[PDB]
Amino acid sequence: SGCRIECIFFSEFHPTLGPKITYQVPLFDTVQVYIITKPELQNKLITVTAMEKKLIGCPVCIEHKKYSRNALLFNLGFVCDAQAKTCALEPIVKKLAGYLTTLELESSFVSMEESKQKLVPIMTILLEELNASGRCTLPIDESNTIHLKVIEQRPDPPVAQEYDVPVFTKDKEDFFNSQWDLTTQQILPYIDGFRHIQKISAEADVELNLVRIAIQNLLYYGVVTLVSILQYSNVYCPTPKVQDLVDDKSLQEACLSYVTKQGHKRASLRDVFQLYCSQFGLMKNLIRRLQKYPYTGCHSYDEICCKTGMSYHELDERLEN
């Protein structure tokens, strides 16, 4: 799950019959919570999100104001626990504030208590459906069907160079062919081809900064970079094996268990480890091709994934070299 919520509440600085009134859907935010957060809920700085700490976690809050005759000022609040990430709720709260604002501006909704009473099962449905699938398609009025979706907000990307080699970790067939951008459809038949100035001028026929920012967005979703597979060692060969030369190094560095100079001892030290903890492919000249030119099933996933479900070996070669 993205984030964990537990309680939603409504509040208002209402006139002299009740100074600060609330509606609640459940934590039970008692007298202490409302005393300890009551100065927060009145400000000339409005239509702005603010979240604060508290004993039970973090409340998030937003306000707005209308009906200056016997002035109207109220507040939505949304309270969760602190010690997690809890940073994917904020445009949803600002969007609900916009929903309530436009609903009041064109229907004159909350001028009477009965509308606010009708507004309570709305809170129940939203409090359940945010935790259900994070999306809400609920018609509250004849002119407002509220639409809500939770974004996981995958974090910040690195910088991509152009001497790089990318590998798509997942498989290609998990997606619609019709549903990509067209530059990505012009590159995606050739991704497992290794280096980048090969791939652009070999099939992409695109511009360098364009494909560099496009692959940076791919890294922002689902691809992992590494360095090229120019054959440095040659004497790694003479221990017998089954087909762990071209694919294995890209896989192992995508699993991030070497230093960059794979050299002439790293691979054999890891190879004998994999061997006991279990003709030519033209072994010279993959590099004269390195410019623009005008078991029986393949085994580089099976044993490594059957390991990778565990973690003792991931200790044993995550303190690698």
Partner: protein, 901 residues
Amino acid sequence: IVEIAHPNDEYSPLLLQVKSLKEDLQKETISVDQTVTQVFRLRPYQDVYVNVVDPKDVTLDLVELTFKDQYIGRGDMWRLKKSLVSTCAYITQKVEFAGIRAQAGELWVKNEKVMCGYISEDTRVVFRSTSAMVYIFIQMSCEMWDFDIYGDLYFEKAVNGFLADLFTKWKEKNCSHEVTVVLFSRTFYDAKSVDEFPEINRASIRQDHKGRFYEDFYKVVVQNERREEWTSLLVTIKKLFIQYPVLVRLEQAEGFPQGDNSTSAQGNYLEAINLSFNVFDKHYINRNFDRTGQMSVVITPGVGVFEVDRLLMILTKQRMIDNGIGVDLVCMGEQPLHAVPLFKLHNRGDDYNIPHWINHSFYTSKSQLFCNSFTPRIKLAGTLSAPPVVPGFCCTVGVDWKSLTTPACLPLTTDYFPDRQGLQNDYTEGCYDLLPEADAQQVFEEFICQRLMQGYQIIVQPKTQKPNPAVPPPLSSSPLYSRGLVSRNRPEEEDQYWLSMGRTFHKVTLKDKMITVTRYLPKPRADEDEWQLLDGFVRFVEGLNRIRMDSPRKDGAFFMEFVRSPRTASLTSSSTLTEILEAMKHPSTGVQLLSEQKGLSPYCFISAEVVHWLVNHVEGIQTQAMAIDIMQKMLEEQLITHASGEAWRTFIYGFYFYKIVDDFASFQRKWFEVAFVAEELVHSEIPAFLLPWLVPEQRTVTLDVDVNNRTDRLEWCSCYYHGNFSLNAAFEIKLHWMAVTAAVLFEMVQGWHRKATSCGFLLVPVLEGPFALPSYLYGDPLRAQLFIPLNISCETYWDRMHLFQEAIAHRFGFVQDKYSASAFNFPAENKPQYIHVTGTVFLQLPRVGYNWAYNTMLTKTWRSSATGDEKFADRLLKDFTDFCINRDNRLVTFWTSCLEK
């Protein structure tokens, strides 16, 4: 000619003006009093000994101005420039030439925006309107219902954000427009079911085996209306977006449906731009008096990719080079990494295509977080070949707000080279010598003879909008149709076109054509004015130039005595056959006879006044025989072959002479309008909104339309006025012209209305769309044809039921809103059409009932306590539906009050 500037020391601004020939400084002034309240205050006297005289050989290469609530033509822009050759230009200047107006703005010189400067003969000009006509379309695809970046939906992003921002900027800059808002989409598998046959097209790839049956759905909101304080349209569009997919889904064919296609799966985009062109091409048929600019905004939530057939693409190219209207924006955000307006050739490596004739822009909301990805994703459960899409520099493109809030008129004077010699084949020249003869219209013979206004060479319009089936979801136009096959046939092959004309005195013009660029050549009236006007009505269509107690006005007297004929409605020994002495001594008392003087009419007396006199003194229906006895000697008109003049309520305008004149054919782009005259009663118009709740046919007058003393040109309009009697029926005047300045004809019609309201009865311009579909010479693709069934629930009986249709028509007359039979002027008058009194409502009378539509040509003026206020038209709609469908006892009492007699 001398040139002054006048700031002081240390200042920020610079102020410069001109007047005539300071050399010795002694006689001078501040040239403008209220330039104080224009710009900057100090006391306006003659002497401060500050003011520096300047040579100022420094120019201002581009100037701009705006118009507000006014119609002109670009020939009037040309003469504005010609009177604007050698003069000053300060910011926010109101200026006037020849009766018409302008307000200055946006004057650049090469890097900088300069507040005050001078313009002479080699700059360039840009004319923009804030009084224009805007057609905004909203595409709806399968991605309007999808979430996006920052967490939002494309619908409320697009509508709420973009339309709210644009309407706030319109309200700030205080413009005025005629809007149309069309919502549209497509559906798939609408194959076969009766009453829904005429609406299906077939998508068809010429080798890969896919051809399916599809349809495009339209729905208009507010049709053609100017109104202040918009943005309630946002609320209506929200409600229609909620009720929209059932309005798409549970209709015509409940087999297997698939609505709301993607933009890249299929698409009806370019077709909608094509029908916007097939509205704007017939803009000349009901010309406005206050609106100039034309703007087609298409909003897509797509990406910039569309796929389309080559044929209609080439067709839209050859139609868009004519006039430039189309502007696209995408409310998706996320500008993608390729040449972003582009087309896949949906033909009959796939073939790629880019347009250069379209202004793209992209929206972005107000939220600021960084790595905005340029990609979608969806999880599954389970012989040139020189352009690709990429190598262009598509970095960042904004909104271009100035090209959105001030629509610009067409380019006047652009750059291309002549057609010297060699391969260029066809040539035609015309020399035109006229004669001293003034017993004006002779320019029309060379006008028809030279080009015939793209006469035999054509502009190519094979878009045949024949069918429109509509649904009774809400009152405006909801058609859902197929737009007819393209009747394409290709024009001219392997040939250019060049013309020339000449007046052998001093004037030559040269004329290149695949686009109409002109090369003018210069060396009782003066011939250069006729030459300039000839260049003007070569421009009018398409005109790219190359660069380096009375008042005896004619119609008004007949109009005011025609007013007098209902103003009073609501002797010696007699029977003597001589009657000569009264026939010349009417004026003994104060008898109104205009027997003094006028041009072309020395001895003025009209026969209706004579009938007034000898019905005050002699009897009434024996009048015509003794009037024949009078007419056997004396005369008023030319030669009789008629009755004794014409006795009661009969209509003769000016121009006594027509016998002892050339015409306008219907295929050389005539500007024409229609005005109608209707009878009002105001003491029921107040309870209309108040608390009570429930002998040839034509005659053609080539009027010289001026109340001024110009000595500039000649300027005339051909009225075709129809009328004969007008007891209580409507009275129509066709207005045709292809001639000189518009706003003077506007103020003549303004004087006609302002004389029609007080001292008489009422005048309103009427849209000449009768109840007529597209694929006509008239017609619009946005007219709903609102049917209303006449429920009943009880020889030659069809005439009888037509009569009682007329009887309930004029009874609906009698309640609040009277009727008039608009027996229109082009012949044979197919179905009875009725205009209602002083309002915006029209009927025709043909299974069950009869059909109804609107006037859009009212435009917040033409106003007394009668007109306007669109809710009145809605009230008449609901009132006739209540009086029509056998409601509670109303048609019951109608049957009793009919059968009582």
